[PDB]
Design an enzyme around this catalytic site. Structure first.
Site, PDB file in Angstrom:
ATOM      1  N   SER A 143       0.846  -1.172   0.000  1.00  0.00           N
ATOM      2  CA  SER A 143       0.000   0.000   0.000  1.00  0.00           C
ATOM      3  C   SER A 143       0.906   1.256   0.000  1.00  0.00           C
ATOM      4  CB  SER A 143      -0.972  -0.039   1.207  1.00  0.00           C
ATOM      5  OG  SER A 143      -2.107   0.802   0.955  1.00  0.00           O
ATOM      6  N   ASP A 169      -7.678  -4.302  -7.455  1.00  0.00           N
ATOM      7  CA  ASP A 169      -7.002  -3.272  -6.699  1.00  0.00           C
ATOM      8  C   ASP A 169      -6.882  -1.959  -7.487  1.00  0.00           C
ATOM      9  OD1 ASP A 169      -5.548  -1.869  -4.748  1.00  0.00           O
ATOM     10  OD2 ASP A 169      -3.796  -3.206  -4.857  1.00  0.00           O
ATOM     11  N   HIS A 226      -7.032  -5.438  -2.629  1.00  0.00           N
ATOM     12  CA  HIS A 226      -5.809  -4.784  -2.076  1.00  0.00           C
ATOM     13  C   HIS A 226      -5.303  -5.509  -0.797  1.00  0.00           C
ATOM     14  CE1 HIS A 226      -2.961  -1.529  -1.645  1.00  0.00           C
ATOM     15  NE2 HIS A 226      -3.480  -1.118  -0.498  1.00  0.00           N
TER      16      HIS A 226
END
Ligand SMILES: *[C@@H]1O[C@H](CO)[C@@H](O[C@@H]2O[C@H](CO)[C@@H](O[C@@H]3O[C@H](CO)[C@@H](O)[C@H](O)[C@@H]3O)[C@H](O)[C@H]2NC(C)=O)[C@H](O)[C@H]1NC(C)=O
Ligand code: CL
Length: 279
Positions: free
Chosen positions: A146, A203, A256
């Site tokens: 991330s 994602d 994600h």
């Protein structure tokens, strides 16, 4: 070079899925209390942690037989990536004084990511050198997810450029764009053989910040599609046109925070401790 969009067709995934699975665990753990002296994750032993995901991302240092000294960087939402793309956090700026001299003229980095890496970089360097000496270990592997994956890319470059012995590998999960085309082609030139960007299913994080703001990914990623499956392909070159935008993204963080080669990176609400190969 600068600002292309590769039209090469995808190829079979050539990355080591065991290493990926491990690396996913090592970074998941940075979303957890990591004060347990000698915690084992996959083949690796936790040696050190600093930060807690409040003022700074948590960073864990491990020794691993397969990955050497592994530095994993947390990706908690210190600022919001999915909102207000005009904000200061997304502005381009010159490289920080610590490593600007290593970069080509015209290199630009995203303010939010660079600032967060700069809060950690000297502590990271000190600890890495300590534990490389203590383990007689030359290999340094940098892992992030991330926000911490864009920070991880900056760190991986920093290690290659500035640390004696340089970088072994980097494994980056759900990687946001970080720098401009000048940056992106310098990544290819300096760590292209060592770079591993892994994107899961739908994602949205690898689409931000947008290219129109002058941002560009380095060459290559492995896209796990369907999300959470064992099917993956590599999409060659920078910003491959046959890749992730050919399939509808999702706004949420589900893929994600999904399953990467049998390891969940569920983030704050995932598994603590991390569980290599549990899925
Ligand atoms: C890929 O796997 C991830 C998990 O690693 C899935 O993410 C999870 O997706 C669900 C919705 O499908 C999220 O909703 C919540 O689920 C929990 C537990 O089931 C429930 O108690 C909540 O009320 C809510 O419904 C869940 O938060 C999310 N997990 C994480 C860690 O983000 C993802 O859906 C998978 N992808 C596919 C395509 O199946
Ligand atoms: Cl903190």
């Amino acid at each position: 070079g600068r600002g292309g969009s590769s039209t090469d067709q995808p190829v079979a995934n050539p990355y080591n899925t065991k290493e990926i699975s491990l690396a996913a665990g090592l970074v998941q753990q940075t979303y957890c209390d990591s004060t347990e002296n000698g915690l084992k994750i996959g083949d690796s032993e936790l040696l050190y942690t600093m930060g807690e995901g409040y003022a700074r991302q948590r960073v864990n240092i491990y020794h691993s037989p397969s990955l050497g000294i592994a530095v994993a960087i947390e990706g908690t939402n210190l600022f919001s990536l999915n909102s207000d793309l005009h904000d200061a956090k997304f502005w381009q700026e010159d490289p920080n004084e610590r490593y600007i001299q290593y970069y080509p003229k015209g290199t630009k980095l995203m303010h939010g990511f660079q600032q967060a890496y700069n809060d950690l970089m000297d502590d990271i360097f000190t600890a890495v050198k300590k534990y490389k000496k203590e383990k007689n270990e030359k290999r340094v592997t940098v892992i992030g997810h991330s926000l911490g994956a864009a920070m991880g890319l900056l760190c991986a470059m920093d290690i290659e450029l500035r640390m004696d012995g340089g970088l072994y590998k980097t494994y980056l999960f759900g990687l946001p764009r970080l720098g401009n085309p000048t940056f992106a082609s310098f990544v290819d030139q300096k760590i292209g053989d060592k770079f591993h960007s892994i994107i899961n299913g739908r994602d949205w994080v690898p689409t931000v910040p947008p290219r129109a703001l002058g941002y560009q990914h380095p060459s290559d990623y492995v896209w796990i599609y369907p999300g959470n499956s064992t099917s993956a392909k590599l999409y060659p070159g920078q910003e491959n046109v046959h890749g992730i935008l050919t399939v509808a993204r999702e706004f949420n963080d589900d893929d994600h925070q999904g399953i990467y080669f049998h390891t969940q990176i569920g983030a704050v609400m995932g598994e603590c401790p991390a569980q290599v190969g549990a899925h």
